[model samples]
Target: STGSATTTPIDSLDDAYITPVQIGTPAQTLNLDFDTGSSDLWVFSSETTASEVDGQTIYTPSKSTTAKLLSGATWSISYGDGSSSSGDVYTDTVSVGGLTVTGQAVESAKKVSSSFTEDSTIDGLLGLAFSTLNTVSPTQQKTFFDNAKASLDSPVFTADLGYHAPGTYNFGFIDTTAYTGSITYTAVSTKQGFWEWTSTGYAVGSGTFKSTSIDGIADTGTTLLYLPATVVSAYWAQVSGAKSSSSVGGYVFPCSATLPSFTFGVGSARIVIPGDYIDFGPISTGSSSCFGGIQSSAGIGINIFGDVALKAAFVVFNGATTPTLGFASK
Candidate 1:
């Protein structure tokens, strides 16, 4: 009961070469966020006027003697929450463990929101994802991958969201320990970088629908799997004693019992949503049991299979080789 698409294998980036250098020259350490949603590297700076922003990480260039401005480069970003930030570019040496990359592109925001100024724990964002979603604007010279691509082996990179633990955001080479075996790949389409798909049909429990389809883009950036209302209701009904919880904004079930697994058919692949993911947090509605992870989006756009779903497999989007993606076990 699976829809089919052309599948391929992805070459690994393990033990690959990457240029690294110190992020903030004088500072001993700088924390970074590895975001796959968009491909832009930005750091909140202490030089930013506090009047323009509040409550976010701010990087201080003066604190690090190694920071170097990128001549006349400018930067800005627009977030989903309707907040925006702008700044200038700076070239610096960024290093991770023993890996060293020099002349790396880092942004220092000039105008940012208070939401960004308050979170001081995080210093900056290190975007290691694809090139399609960059906010660096018309100037084509400002990509993290573009700067570091020359030194990388196989012209490829991979992310290992290791075992749901803290500091699992390390990058560079694909960690073989994170994958179960060789990566299983799907042919990339010629369209934009969105992970487009073709569905044959759908099912509820053991019953299959013969004539229905849904088009979607597989995004690791989004957290929720936004399904159509009809599909959401159909899938919910299959769970025994499962009901909608208005307070939680999605289907909530009792954790006292083991919940049944929900499997989705994607081109020959049966992606299983396990019971643990289903029943995640503590159950509400006066039930002593814990709740699950399915949130409702009655009027949202396309669906996304975030980290919860992604951790089960290794996904590789090959922009260099062909317009195709490879998915394997981890």
Candidate 2:
């Protein structure tokens, strides 16, 4: 059956969008981040230590008669941001929107890094990446999308990330009404367990579009757009009063600076980011400095098209044979 879910931005952070998910027989609902960078259906649960559990909602297996322990099975994951979590495993029914998948592997966290423990609003991560990236031990677990795909009419999903507004994650179908213009498709390479693609090049503002190739992943978990150091420097150079600040952790510009639009090429499609979207808010209250939404992916090695970039377009994570990505103006 076709399914869909509405996703809303976390008001305070506004960095990630979360959707409601139900787990087990009695249905313990949790607001989970649907991440495309990693594969692991993990949640903060009764297994977490008291001190480690902050404001997160806990899932208790004892409360669900359908939850069954997968003895000796465990999962551990470390994110690019250095956050991590380790936990035991349980098999239970998991549902997203109206789509249900029985016997889905659910990792219940027992340990979490400070980064995750401090985020009180996020209950867990709903991994949408390829199952090959699953972190479970012994045998890797399949993602909810993978498990529910066989029963779907088209095995497809779309991520419509809005700017400071509610978006949607449509499963098993593509809603043409959600976007404008034609969807330009590009072949995806999943060798790295990501929806990796090559950009034809980019342009700063209304300048000439370059033809260099940039390889990167479409990561929903990342908050900012990350590209090569040279590319980031080029964009910052065009902005007056902009500087790379170690203190602010990236390039920062005057809040009054005239920011330039940024563009990325996918085949013949030129996806552009508006000037205002590049300003990631002020560094602090009463501060005239603002952090840039685009930064260098130097240390990370690979570029990332995070929410900053994804929100500018309607993205299709096509799971059909050889999986491709289709983009269109939102």
Candidate 3:
């Protein structure tokens, strides 16, 4: 079976991509982020208080006849950004595009962090990473993708993320037409329950390619492209007014300065992020200092090839027993 879904950027900066998901018998649809960094299909639900519910949609599990409480089951997850969410668990008929998984564990959030509450565009997160990363306990639960794998024609999924426009996520088979040239596939390390891989090296705009092994995760949930300090410094040093400041967090440069495009090697694949895309956005409202889409991996600890880098090309997240990642130019 093949399933496809459309995900749209929440804001101009492409902060997060939200995909509409059906989570009940009557098909209560909610916009959720298909995060590849973590595992757990948690949503804001009836369990949370009205005070916690902002201008966001919430799932009323009690209203869904198919909803069953996973008694004695609970889940909690924390991110590197210091935001977290935790709650009880339930099983329901969850559907993404045409893919349907009955008796799928749908986590209900009883509590969420301020960042989540403030982000009204996202209702929850649907983890696309391995089931081993699932946070559910007592009896560990499998992710939506893990349960749907057996039914899929091919145990694989693809992420075709866009810059500011809507993109598509496909399961079961690859759309050969979506990309150009042969796909360059690479091995993925599921050690930390992430879609982790090593990028061969990188180069600045019109600069020589540097051969270095950079380990990072291809996280759709994150917003920026974080790389090693050496790489980040190399890029920023080329900009006249760019500087890494403690006040603004990471590297920030004059808004008027024309940024340089970045190129990274994924196997022999050369993925490029245009200079315009690297000019992330202004540090503050009406400020001349602009924050960069690419930042240093120092504080983040792990290098992350977020939307900033993923949008540069078409990506296939192979979920076979031996997982791998595929990349191709769009």
Better of 2 and 3 by TM-score: 3
lDDT of 1 by residue, 1-330 (tens): 101111111111110111122466654454555445556677767767767545444567766677787777777777543556678877676665444566667777777766555544445566655566666545534455545555555444554332223213233344556557566555534354455554434555456543455565455444445556777677667666778777765776656656655555545554455545455545435666555454444545555445444544566545465545556654
Which is the better candidate, 1 or 2, if ranked by lDDT? Answer: 2
Highest-lDDT candidate: 3
- All models: lDDT? 0.53, 0.91, 0.92
Model 1, global lDDT: 0.53
> Regarding lDDT, does 2 or 3 come out ahead?
3
Error at 216, model 2, angstroms: 0.3
Cα distance off (Å), candidate 3, residue 289: 0.7
Report the C-alpha displacement of residue 311, candidate 1, in angstroms.
Answer: 1.4
Top TM-score prediction, candidate number: 3
RMSD of 2: 1.2
Error of 3 at 309 (Å): 0.6
Winner of 1 and 3 under lDDT = 3
Angstrom error of the Cα, residue 82, model 1: value is 5.1
